[PDB]
Structures are given as structure tokens and as C-alpha cells.
């Protein structure tokens, strides 16, 4: 009937890799850099901005003011480009899957497999982790092992929230196909609409929690 966690695969250096899904993260990676090309194309400084320029600007001033409170913008200006690139790359990696290719599909959100996701979890972790020791070389020791639980739990949380959330949509778009076709278009449209919203809000949460964990790493 339905089988979760099924992808094409291959090996490139003795280690195994997926042959499927990787294309989906590549289309996303091409789309984010292609959009930027357009930004430089029609970027304005004393005139009216293009649709791509006002879009990213709106993201850039959002992420900038969020980081402002997290940590002195000067203390760590490197968090800002990381936050906007995380946001837009997760945003399109979720939205790209609004293109149904069932025939089994061809366009599946990279967030579907934990790999695309443990990355945004461990890359972000190694990022603020070093920022913490760069910066400084809790309230009650009686509870201090819970901090070690909490710092191990942060990358797990980031990972499993993004994975389980988009993976739920990855199941539900297969589940609805068992429903007769003359009716299934209605719950399919309703789910796709909700998955656009949740796909955006998931990118917003991942970017914000990234900034907030950089703040907790670099305070004092």
C-alpha cells in the first residue's frame, strides 16, 4: 500500500548515498543562487526595487532585527547571512514539493529524509558551538546534567522538528491517493494549502531558533 523512507541509492567513495531526493535539494540549491543572480541584475539603490529585491530585503531586515536582540549585531554579523540562507533554502525546499509528480513521485522535499535534515542540525550546531568557545574561550548546579541533556537536545530538536513535520506531508500526499480520484482533489487541495503555510512557518522557526541558539552560545 504505502512504504515510508524509500529512495534511489548509489555509492561514490565506498559510502552509500541516495540517488533520489538529491536532485530535489539540487533544484533548491540552483533556485536560491539563480534568484540572487536576478537580485544583482535589477538591484536598485536610488530607484524603485524589483520583486526579488523587495522580497529578500523584507527577509534581510527581519533576520537583522531578530539577531539584533539575540547578540550585538557587531559581536557576530556572520549569523545574519547564515539565518537568511537557512530561511530561504528551507522555504523553497518545503515549497518545491507543492509540485505533485505521483505516477511514486519525482519532486520530494529534501526535508523528507533525515539526512537533508541532520545537516541543518549539525552544521548549525558546529557553527554556534565554535562561536561559544570563540566568545568565552547554569543557575543551579544541582540540576547541571540537565544542561548537557538540553545542549544535546537542541540539534536533535531542530532535526526532528523539520524532519517529522515535512515527512508528515510526505506521507499525507500518498495517503490521499488511496481516496477515489473524483473526490480526492478537495482534501488534496486543502492539505497542499496547509503544507505551503506550514512549509514557510517551519523555515521561519528553524531560522529563529538558530539565531536564539547562537545568542545562548555567545552571551557573556
Amino acid at each position: 500500500q504505502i512504504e515510508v523512507g524509500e529512495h534511489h541509492t548509489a555509492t561514490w567513495l565506498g559510502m552509500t548515498v541516495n540517488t533520489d531526493t538529491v536532485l530535489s535539494t539540487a533544484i533548491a540549491g540552483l533556485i536560491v543562487i539563480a534568484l540572487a543572480f536576478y537580485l544583482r541584475a535589477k538591484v536598485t539603490s536610488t530607484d524603485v526595487p524589483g520583486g526579488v529585491q523587495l522580497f529578500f530585503e523584507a527577509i534581510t531586515i527581519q533576520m537583522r532585527n531578530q539577531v539584533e536582540s539575540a547578540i550585538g549585531m557587531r559581536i557576530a554579523p556572520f549569523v545574519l547571512p547564515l539565518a537568511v540562507t537557512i530561511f530561504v533554502f528551507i522555504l523553497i525546499s518545503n515549497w518545491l514539493a507543492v509540485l505533485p509528480v505521483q505516477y511514486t513521485e519525482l519532486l520530494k522535499s529534501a526535508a523528507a529524509d533525515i539526512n537533508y535534515v541532520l545537516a541543518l542540525a549539525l552544521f548549525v550546531f558546529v557553527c554556534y558551538h565554535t562561536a561559544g568557545i570563540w566568545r568565552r574561550g547554569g543557575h543551579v548546579t544541582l540540576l547541571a546534567p540537565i544542561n548537557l541533556v538540553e545542549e544535546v537536545a537542541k540539534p536533535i530538536s531542530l532535526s526532528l522538528r523539520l524532519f517529522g513535520n515535512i515527512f508528515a506531508g510526505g506521507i499525507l500526499v500518498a495517503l490521499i491517493a488511496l481516496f477515489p480520484p473524483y473526490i480526492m482533489w478537495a482534501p488534496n487541495a486543502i492539505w497542499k494549502a496547509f503544507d505551503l503555510f506550514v512549509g514557510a512557518i517551519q523555515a521561519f522557526i528553524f531560522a529563529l531558533l538558530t539565531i536564539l541558539y547562537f545568542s545562548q552560545a555567545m552571551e557573556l
Binding site: 504505502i2 512504504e3 515510508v4 523512507g5 531578530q66 530538536s157 526532528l160 522538528r161 524532519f163 517529522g164 513535520n165 515527512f167 508528515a168 506521507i171 512557518i201 517551519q202 521561519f204 522557526i205 529563529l208 531558533l209
Partner: protein, 79 residues
């Protein structure tokens, strides 16, 4: 084998029962603060949707993390 298959469906049913309890109440309690803030002052929502979607993103994880483990139990049973 059918005893393990029943244990997987009951175990996965528990995981998704507690997930929807946790998130459904958690979102009601988080949105109760949004609706009360926007009753106190309308412009609040403007700077409310950041604290609200941070809260919803922390609450909804309880349910989503559970939906990932329910799918493992039910479709790809570990034993």
C-alpha cells in the same frame, strides 16, 4: 508475527494519541495569549506573530516528533 503487528499498531496509536493531546492543548493555550493580546491592543498581532510562531514551533514539535516515531513503529517495525 501477528502479536508484534498488533503491538506496533497499539504502540503507534498511543504515540499519535499523546501527540495530538500535547499539541492541540498547547496551541489552544498559546493562541489564547495571541487572541487576548490582540483584544488588549490591535497592533499587538504585528509583533505577536513572532512570539506566537516561536511558541507554535516548540509546541508542534512534540506532535511531529511523535508522528515520525509512529511511522517507524507502524510501517517499518523495529523488531
Amino acid at each position: 508475527d501477528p502479536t508484534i503487528a498488533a503491538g506496533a499498531l497499539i504502540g503507534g496509536g498511543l504515540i499519535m494519541a499523546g501527540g495530538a493531546i500535547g499539541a492541540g492543548i498547547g496551541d489552544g493555550v498559546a493562541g489564547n495569549a495571541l487572541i487576548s493580546g490582540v483584544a488588549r491592543q490591535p497592533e499587538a498581532q504585528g509583533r505577536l506573530f513572532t512570539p506566537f510562531f516561536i511558541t507554535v514551533g516548540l509546541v508542534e514539535a512534540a506532535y511531529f516528533i511523535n508522528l515520525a516515531f509512529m511511522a517507524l513503529f507502524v510501517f517499518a517495525t523495529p523488531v
